[model samples]
Target chain A: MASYGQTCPRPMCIPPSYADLGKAARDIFNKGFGFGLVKLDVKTKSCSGVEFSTSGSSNTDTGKVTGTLETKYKWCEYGLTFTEKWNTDNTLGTEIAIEDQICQGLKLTFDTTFSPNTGKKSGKIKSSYKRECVNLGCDVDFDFAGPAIHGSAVFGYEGWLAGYQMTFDSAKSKLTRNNFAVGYRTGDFQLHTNVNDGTEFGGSIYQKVCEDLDTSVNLAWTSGTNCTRFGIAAKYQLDPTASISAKVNNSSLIGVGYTQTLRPGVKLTLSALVDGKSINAGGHKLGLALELEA
Target chain B: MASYGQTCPRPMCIPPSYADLGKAARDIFNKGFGFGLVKLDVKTKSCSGVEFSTSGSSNTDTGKVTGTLETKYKWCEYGLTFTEKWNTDNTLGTEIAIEDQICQGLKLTFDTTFSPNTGKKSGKIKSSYKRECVNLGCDVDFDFAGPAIHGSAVFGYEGWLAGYQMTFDSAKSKLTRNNFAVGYRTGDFQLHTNVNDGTEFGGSIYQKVCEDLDTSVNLAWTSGTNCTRFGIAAKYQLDPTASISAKVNNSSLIGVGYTQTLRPGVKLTLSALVDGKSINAGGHKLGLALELEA
Candidate 1:
């Protein structure tokens, strides 16, 4: 994962044209500054709001107002944001995250968060450096009355057939933890893994076994507790709009799921998980999810 | 739902022309592979990553890193993918999946996973068979030291006016579960339903009562628990890219929501769910989601 403290790849890149937004993006955005929206779900629901955002020499800004119609806005380079939480005890919060592009590949961001009701505030600063396939970043967090007491750093590299990342953290002037990850791909095969402080580790592999079949496996373990789990999963395409997948792990967990595109703008997925080692782990879990795109 | 225990429609199929990676496959992959990546509910955040993979004869790969700046990629015949995770105890994890065509309608794939620190390992094998509207698949799993002791199968068929799937489990040595689903579409009316073990049942009916309006009713019952729920929902398309929807269930859940695309890369959604049952259940649940494609 790209560290949040770091700058993303191509830190100086520009936005794609409207035509390049793609249907999903365009559908959600409505085209141009136009509003395009769609929503379909079985369990949860959402409301609508007008939103606008743009980037360029003029300065970048984005805005939105959701249910009960509360508005929010953020200025990109200016590093300013305002949010209204109408349904909360504290109704408003303001944040400022200013960015200074030091060079073609280096950027620095300073952020502050404040709650109007509580008169409480916190701050953070992040620095990111990017060049070609290597990305680096650092972050520090503090409060209004305290000096920076937390810090972290991250590094990433895009290699010939793989990508890698490493992150480190410190607190009270002492090294705390570090993590590393790498992912590689070739033809019909792919692999990925990550580890932290010799305590926790996890990895996953995926393969396109055939024209119509693809599969993967994942594993996680905690060296300190000697607790480990192995998960294997696979996905098979049924036509272009439908497919099924299954996963099982040594933790006594097994699941089977299926997904289908009922039609344009609509899709559905259902999954069931059963624990072989437990008779009443909810007696199995059933989930159904639906999505729609305008 | 695609049954994980059965094969998909077809395990055999060939890649289409480069030109034929066309919108549908891309759409289906987009749909099937649909990141469904909306991570709302306010508890988690994600980091960016550099990823790339390609299908067909060409080995094109796409990559991305996120934050204030981001990059992305896609290829047809090849599958689709993206990986992310930031801000967690274990800071790093990566994923990659690739696919290939072996024959006119068959494919092959390989995958590997590793977490250098913990030494945990696992692998999987998957096979798919597809022809016409019928799809089937089987998967096997093995850990580093153990033989393949876990497996599942899936089968699906898309007939003239309906779809069906069946799954089987071996570890439990039982039929597991079977489902039959059928849907009929004609003009402005649609109907869909599925039955499982005669103990669980569900169905939905939809009608485009007007050019701008849609209505639907859903019913579900579990004979084993003697629990039954029925819900009625409706949607009003305000425009090609905007709409409003509302639903009510016998369980004392009612919701109304709206969605709209404000621009090319920005969208907004708001929803409010009211518990008709009691105030203690929280009179209402409010949700607001903003999707930004940067």
Candidate 2:
């Protein structure tokens, strides 16, 4: 297998690609992965003056968490799949499809813990709007589904999908006072279920980003309750430090978590769940995110 | 004397040796003239719960009256004392130092009338905020003496002076109706005064033009008063012609007059003014208007 520093042309795995992994690999070809501080910001404005009492104030601030390691690796497994499967070798614009497990079939699962002092932790998976790529820095989406749906029915089987995480964050101090009353959400996991079936769904929704957090929207039909099952969930990292989100499924669950950088390329996290079932196919699993480039 | 169809680049005339002749000649040059068509429009919104009641249910069709003649002329003559005296001259843009009548010696009496209609019968004037250059088929103006105000002050003036005339005896068909009212504003005149005092103290103001409208601010005094003083004042062109305006000088005068247009350049008027009268002046009086221009 080739080493990690060699330039690999267009590498492909599946029919359609989720991101430009070849280019991503090339970018890392020279810079080895290492931990660096991540910054976050929060701001809020009241529209009706209902939110403001005696204080003519709104929240706005920026915070930074200590540096953490971003791993760098050269895996032949990722390189060969792009060079042979996608036929992207040697071509600049040639797009390579992601491998089933490496691209289309890839799903992420992780849990988190947070404290008031360490800042807040939040995770989110922003699905592609169209056929756009989603690598390191992908586009942020806000609609129910990619592109958008106008005539779609109400019990709308349309929602965005992406990787998610959660943590108790205070680094984004600006967001905590105004519109942000509470900031805790639970179950940092990805959903693969269809939007149509509610019983088969599972995810969380927090009441507020500062307190009383919960995961409210994981759509799934109970074992003997209905036909099929599905769920949808989302977590938003207001900043690199703090996050809040919600989930819904068999029951509602709210969580708050925090992340600690033990060493380079390794992130240690601790979290808790409440008003939610402890028994789930996706358990109190410890998720790991590492980079292998250059 | 020059005849019609004759264009004169330079023409000189000596007035008869008389004070009246001198005054008439000077008056002509003092008052520069202009002409334009004036249109008044009214719009009312729908009433509560009823849209149709608010809009234009009917329209009054009034044909446009031709433009009036504007003239300024100046000349000189020998007075009874056989001394040079300056009086109304049928010339413009020239400064004249005439022998003042009261002084009886070499005195200057210079004043100009702002009249659009050059006839003597109506004794009415029409001055607009619009300054148009016929040669260029466009509007042009240079502010030299007054402050500029838009939609607030009289255009081009500290206020505006306007005169109107129409004979619609044929409108006896639409008078005295609930939704219709028609009356003739024979020799109708109105003065729109600007409220800004900046020009009075010689304070400088900028001049501006918004599209076709002329605007400016300078140091000058502008005044307008309805001289025709007539009433019967109603829009005699619609199903129910209607007209209403407040009198400016404490009280508004009303007049009913018999008008006969002998030709485009000549008119004969015999009217009785009944409103806004003083102890000895401003009453019913017959006036004549004679016009001469290409």
Candidate 3:
């Protein structure tokens, strides 16, 4: 109250040098952190690699260090990658990929992997077709030794305030599983849903709570299991290099994560989880990670 | 010193325009170099995917090339990814992911993978729930054709001085694996440990020995082998855009690595390893890689 009595002292404006520090810190967080990850926003980040979580389940440890090298010449690009796993007899695997823009709004990519020790290998082909507001694509796999095959197709449309997508898969037969999704978005909020065979349904909502916070919630159910599950997650960015996030579900499980920049470009993250339903359900779970660009 | 003999050459102060060069250089370093990797800092980077070593074993390579494309609408996010390996007949694997936030603090994510050659497929469902200080999440995978089901759960908490996590896995209706970790940090030093099943134990220490030097030492042992593995690695940033690192294990293997930003956002990394104990163990290994974000 005494401090309120006096005119709140005008905090001195930050010096330009200190402001420069903030700018440097922000830049480091933006560029020095992407070592090997798939980024969606072209304007937001940079890099290359497979977009899917290849490890399948998030918890499975693949036990490998993979490196990629690539080059681009106009509309055509080529890449070579090496994978190594220690403590194994066959420690090396190599892959080469080629991508080309065949025409306007159409592209093709092909890749092959070879094992140095086993004399075994595999290959894949993918094609992308796109337009201003509509997109379509498909890919096929060929297993030589196994002599097996399968693939999928995707169709999408983007509208002023809405979007939609339908996908179909062909495995043993012509078409096996199919799903459709539609979404609507406004300034700072969005909603969407997905349905398959009219038996499984899921929906979600996303909101920008404030300048530095984003949150989302989801719900899903299946007639087969007659069970429904719900979950929520939120992310808060304290600065360009610091953030805290938390997520939970109705199943009595909770998780919290924190990331921070330790130096100019070095970053550290810590995530932990706890179970509220059972005492012996792995007392507590923790994940620790560190990344450096240099 | 002879250079100290003369009243240190009075140099002219740098002009403001040249000061702008530093800003540009810093920006280039910040946003230009996301090679195929994940980083730990929050302030200076952007992208999706996990940070930290998902591949817990330092020496494993699952030779595969993966790519992803994603879109976001207010309530829903969609992702499509491709994975391929070479020298084999069935080489292409494609996956689609959908994420929805149905309400506050709840979310759902589903993904399915298909092989084009054999028509084999698998699917997973993940849910998350969250609160201010505690969080939880789980994911389950269903191998329809294989009929194998497995999942994992997470729990976490956040505080000023430390953080923790606990994770549990279920396979064949039995608790298969559980792990716990604890980390504490103050300034440029960090310490953490992992203990699982009372059989495998690992711990690490990280320190910023100086402004341009960072080092980590890891000690791990598995009950089956009853052999302890000790590894020490250090990195030195020669400049904002270049660094070198090296590691040596108690085993007769030591490796060295170097990285540099060539152009604006292009990077190159080189690594080599030598066998110290055996003469016929693949004499040596050398890896070279380059990345471009364009």
Candidate 4:
């Protein structure tokens, strides 16, 4: 919301980037999961062993079309990728990244993006460093404006972790975007809590109900607005090839999803959203997704 | 060419079908090597693991297009396939085959084909039986021209084998279509000779120069015409991902080919044919092929 010039925080070049500071609870509501669209993906490898993939999606109700074409080439510890994306509004966006390892525990990447329709370019020079107990990363915005810096540091001791996201603020000389978080994760259980701007607080807990089922709970509160929210979600694998999941928030908005693999390199996913209080209303929505790889 | 109601003798459904009596020699000339044309192949598997593939080719000289779309579903030892082909002449053709194990060492197949433009249909019910040292097979025409039968039996003793192909005759009840052949094949060497109708003699010898090279020689002599032909061909692996091959016949028609794998499931092949007598003429030909699998 500040004059950071980025719609969101520039993700760090680290395993647990600042963008994923509360990933454990965030994922319960489908943070990184690809869902909720009529989508199709096809992928292949070139004779030179370069990887290529194209995907398209349609919004049934709005009749909007969107998709992306991307290719990646990898040799030894070096990698490069280029991506072209078409948004629902029909604007083409370009993204490119070149990455390589400089040493045993360090990697460097140059990532950039351009929007032709908006005539805008944003990029970042990023690097990540890892040691026995500490993981650190930083990014500097490469744009027309003065360089904006972002960084994150996380220290781990067994299952316990302490981390923070830091970005300089203009109005307060403090954090325009900042989060202090602590996490404890084991193979079967995860607990995380973070406070943002010293005013908003959030916490999440996740547990595996069994080998085939996982569930999570997330709670958030803002002191300024005196508002609070809570949510719960669960996922269950029906079999080796099929899975189902559901989630509901305090507002009574419920979501459900199902995914299945038709073949070794083929998959299908379906998702739906409904309002609990108006279950009989015509406000519910549905989606479908398909993937093929060769 | 005898009008046995079919264009060619129905091939027996055995390990070494009558059509492949001298496979060692035929393969030397690129039989089944799928070359010559600007070709492309794409293949995939369905959700149920059904195999599907579509292939196309372009004849540069004629600017003609052709391709086949086929799918196969297999369960245990059973397989069913359906194919639709578009010929260079723009005619559509259909082919279907169903095969299954009849017993431990026996298999039965019903194969059929039809041409829409010609309104012609040809089919056959075939079976093959194999034992410790013998392989036997028979195919009977399933058409309106009355059933025509073809059979083949090959007996093998270590590296030596004796085989014969038999078909009912009309011009001469003794032999209208027949070939008596003998072959000896070791892991790295092969020798075969066959007398067709007891007048035309053909022989082939194949040898592997090393683990990465193979060469073959073939000769055919017709007693009635007092004519003879000879050919020599060799193939060499350039590396784990590339190969080169060449062949030349007594008539001075020479062919060279090269193949390479760009990735795990990606391949490219190039072939050229040149007339040794008219090296400066434009009568020579070139071809290219590409394949992709997932």
Cα misplacement distance, residue A262 of candidate 4 (Å): 14
What interface root-mean-square deviation (Å) does model 4 yield?
Answer: 7.6
What are the per-residue Cα lDDT tens digits for candidate 3 across A138-167?
Answer: 556555543233332323233222222233
Residues B1-294, model 3: lDDT tens digits: 222211211111111111121122232122322233332221222244222111101121434433322222221243322211111122222223332324344446665544423346666766654434333455666675333333333232331122223333333445555555554443576565666767888777767788998777777889879789887777788999998877777987777778888886667776777788774575576655655443
Per-residue lDDT of B62-181 in model 2, one digit per residue for the tens? 332322222222233432121121222322122223432222212332233332245211111111111211000001111222111111001111222221111111112111111101
Give the DockQ (2 decimals) of all models. 0.01, 0.00, 0.02, 0.02
Listed in order, each prediction's TM-score against the native is: 0.37, 0.18, 0.37, 0.56
lDDT of 2 by residue, A202-234 (tens): 322322212222222322345445453322233
* Local lDDT at B162 for model 2: 22
Considering only N, C-alpha and C atoms within 3 Å, which residue pairs clash in candidate 4?
A47-B262, A262-B47, A294-B294
If ranked by DockQ, best first, what sequence of candidates would result? 4, 3, 1, 2
Quantify how close model 2 is to the true structure by its C-alpha RMSD in Å: 30.9
Off by over 4 Å in 4: A1-268, A272-286, A290-294, B1-15, B31-36, B77-100, B118-120, B169-175
Task: Name the docking class for model 3.
Answer: incorrect
- The C-alpha RMSD of each candidate to the native structure, in angstroms, is 32.0, 30.9, 24.2, 12.7
User: What's the chain B TM-score of candidate 1?
Assistant: 0.57
- Candidate 1 TM-score over all chains jointly: 0.37
Q: Distance (Å) between predicted and true CA of B108, model 2?
A: 40
Residue-by-residue lDDT tens digits, candidate 1, B1-294 = 522422323322322221221222122112211121222111112233333211111111221112222123333445633333222122333333343333232333333344445655555555544444443444455455433422222222322234434444445555555666555544566566667766788877767688898777777889779788888777778997677877777988777777765543334566666788685566555555444332
What 10-residue stretch in candidate 3 chain A is worst by lDDT? A10-19
